């Protein structure tokens, strides 16, 4: 599968809020978000596992600048490709 990371999540994101913004654009196998250690909230790290590529990349398309409440998210491949 094609990794993507969600960077600036907000403190109340969760799993179920990556399925249901990454579901809607195809498979997704996996997903996870890091919390913090010590107060249990979301650090604002996410990542997505989709099986797809060009799936992956409408998703990735669409979502990066998202504003997910208060927040615009930064939506990415792990490294950029010119082709
Ligand atoms: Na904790």
Not at 36 to 53: H, L, P, Q
Request: a positive charge.
């Amino acid at each position: 599968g094609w990794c993507i990371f969600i960077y600036n999540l907000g403190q109340d994101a969760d799993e179920g809020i990556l399925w249901q913004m990454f579901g809607p654009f195809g498979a997704v196998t996996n997903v996870k978000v890091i919390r913090d250690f010590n107060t249990n909230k979301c650090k604002g790290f996410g990542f997505v596992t989709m099986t797809n590529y060009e799936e992956a990349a409408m998703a990735i398309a669409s979502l990066n600048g998202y504003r997910l409440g208060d927040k615009i998210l930064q939506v990415s491949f792990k490294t950029n490709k010119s082709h």
